[PDB]
Design an enzyme around this catalytic site. Structure first.
Site: not given
Ligand code: CU
Length: 98
Positions: A38, A83, A86, A91
């Site tokens: 992430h 993020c 994602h 996200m």
């Molecule tokens: Cu992520």
């Protein structure tokens, strides 16, 4: 200070909580929970002027399980962040600093 788990245990890739409210000078700890890697790329827009997002943006990706990124936000205002890996999955999050 407040802690954000990056991703639910179920495997869903979401900021938990998505909308977090903190005070001025509180530290946000983005702890990897699931779905790593992430990263936290604060958006240049929808933020206090001067593009402070880049300085508080995590260009690097947290890969080790339980890796924690600690960022102190003193400037008041919403911080809209997302993020990238994602970002298409929704996200994203927003941190209201007061
Ligand atoms: Cu992520």
């Amino acid at each position: 200070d407040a802690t954000v788990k990056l991703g639910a245990d179920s495997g869903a890739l979401e900021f938990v909580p998505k909308t977090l409210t903190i005070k001025s000078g509180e530290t946000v700890n983005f702890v990897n929970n699931a779905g790593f890697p992430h990263n936290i790329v604060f958006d240049e827009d929808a933020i206090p002027s001067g593009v402070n997002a880049d300085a508080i943006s995590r260009d690097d990706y947290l890969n080790a399980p339980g890796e924690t990124y600690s960022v102190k936000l003193t400037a008041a205002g919403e911080y809209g962040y997302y993020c990238e890996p994602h970002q298409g999955a929704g996200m994203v999050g927003k941190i209201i600093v007061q």
